[PDB]
Every structure is written in structure tokens, then in C-alpha cells.
From a paper:
The R2TP complex is found in organisms from yeast to humans, and consists of the AAA+ ATPases Rvb1 and Rvb2 (human: RUVBL1 and RUVBL2), a TPR-containing protein, Tah1 (human: Spagh or RPAP3), and Pih1 (also known as NOP17 and Pih1D1, but referred to as Pih1 henceforth; Kakihara and Houry, 2012; Te et al., 2007). The biological roles ascribed to the R2TP complex are directly associated with its ability to interact with the Hsp90 chaperone system and function as an Hsp90 cochaperone (Boulon et al., 2010; Izumi et al., 2012; Takai et al., 2010).
We determined the crystal structure of the mouse PIH domain1–200 with single-wavelength anomalous dispersion phasing of Tel2-peptide cocrystals (see below) grown with SeMet protein (see Experimental Procedures) and used this to phase the mPih47–179 apo and SELDpSDDEF peptide-bound structures, which were refined to 2.1 and 3.3 Å, respectively. Our structural and mutational data characterize the PIH domain as a phosphopeptide-binding domain that appears exquisitely adapted to providing specific interactions with phosphoserines (and possibly phosphothreonines) embedded in highly acidic surrounding sequences, characteristic of CK2 phosphorylation sites.
Numbering used by the authors:
A (entry chain A), B (entry chain A): 47 to 179
The structure:
Amino acid sequence: QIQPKPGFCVKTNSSEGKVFINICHSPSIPPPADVTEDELLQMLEEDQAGFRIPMSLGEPHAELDAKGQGCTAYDVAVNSNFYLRMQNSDFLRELVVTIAREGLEDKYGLQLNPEWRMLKYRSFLGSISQQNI
Amino acid sequence: QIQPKPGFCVKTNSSEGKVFINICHSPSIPPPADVTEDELLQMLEEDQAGFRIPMSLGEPHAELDAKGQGCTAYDVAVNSNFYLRMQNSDFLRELVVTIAREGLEDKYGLQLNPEWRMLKYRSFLGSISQQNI
Ligand SMILES: [Co+2]
Ligand SMILES: [Co+2]
């Protein structure tokens, strides 16, 4: 089993309560092809990101927020080199988080509310070494 | 006739030579609806930006680059308030430039090479007051 490395943590919410998405990474996860930005838009218009941007869409795990309240986390893990590209591009980072949100909704039957933010001081919600992919 | 206001200038290239895209603006151009980022991804996957992100796809105009060499400019003008949002979001700015590039290719039969950059010291290539939309 592959243990993910923390990347960054996205806080959002839903009619079912608070949700955190750990955008995390591993060198064991296949990277997307390195396409141009023009080609990336094409991928979206052809609705092919489901196959062309590999990511793990992790199972929900119950956790606690900083106020000690119950919430739900999901680990979305991508290739480490791809993660490092995402970090250095607001465009790519926001796009990939948006794709990951859609992926979790479709996979788990969730309905997220649209507002989200990347946490500044906390990288991952949950026990990392317990969250094998 | 509506005169566009300069926004920023994108330098790119093509098998036909150097191309500049003036991402410019006017309060007379209808704004896109103010959708969420989740909804924006949906718009792209449904390939509906052609109707849902209004922009003028300006006619080509011959100009000169800083080296005195011939090149071609196109003015892509959006609503001023929308422009100001784009400015303060790398994600939105890169997405809209990518959409504008596609729009010009489809409208004018162009094939742009993928590399482009936003000029840092020059806002618009061409005679602004002559470029009525
Ligand atoms: Co298209
Ligand atoms: Co979809």
C-alpha cells in the first residue's frame, strides 16, 4: 500500500456538514501527460479529465475540526511531480481542486457548496500514515 | 462605435508569424453571469463558453513589434467589471486568455503555437482610438 504525502488542505462545506479535501501526493501515482494550456482547455471541452488527469478519489474518513466538531475528509492524491507543478501555478491549482471536487461528487454522491479555501497553516486532516491508497 | 480600453497584451506566435492578442475591455460589452468556479468547470465540460463568456473577437490588424518587424494583432474585448475580476485572478486570467485564443483560431482559421506570455511593460499593440468594436 502507498502512503500519501501531504500537499495542501481544502476546507469546504455541504448540506451534510463540513468537508475537507486533502490534496496530497505520491511518486507512485501516474502523472498526467504534460499537455499545453491550449490542450488542457481542449481536454475539458471534450470532458476527458476523468481519464487524462490521474488521481485517487479517496474514501471518506471521519475526523474532527479545530473546534472539536465532526467533519468528513477525502484524500485526493496525484503524482508528486504534478503536485509540485500545481503548487507553482494558481491556475493549475484551482483547476485541479475544481476537478477533484467534481470527481468526489460523482463518485460518492455528494453535493458540495461552492465556497472553498486552501488552508494556510495546516497541510492534511487525518492520520497520514493510516491513509494508504 | 465603442472604443476599447487597454487591459493587457499577450505575445504569442504561429506558423504565420508573431501574433499579439490585446485583452481589452469596455463597460458596453455584456458581462458573463457571475458563476461559481464549480459552475465554470461545468460550462467548459459542456463546451458553452462561446455563448456564456461574452467577448469581441476582433479583426486582425497589421502592426509592428518593438524590432520594427511586421506582426498581427487581434483585440479581444470583454466587460470592464469582468476584466477587473480577471486581473485579480491568475486562474481566471489564464483561462480567459486560453478561451480567447481558441475563439480566434475558430473564427479566423488560425493555428497558434502554444507558448504565450503577458507583456509586463506594454498594455496594447495598435492605435487604440482607431480600434472601435
Ligand atoms: Co472547442
Ligand atoms: Co462532468
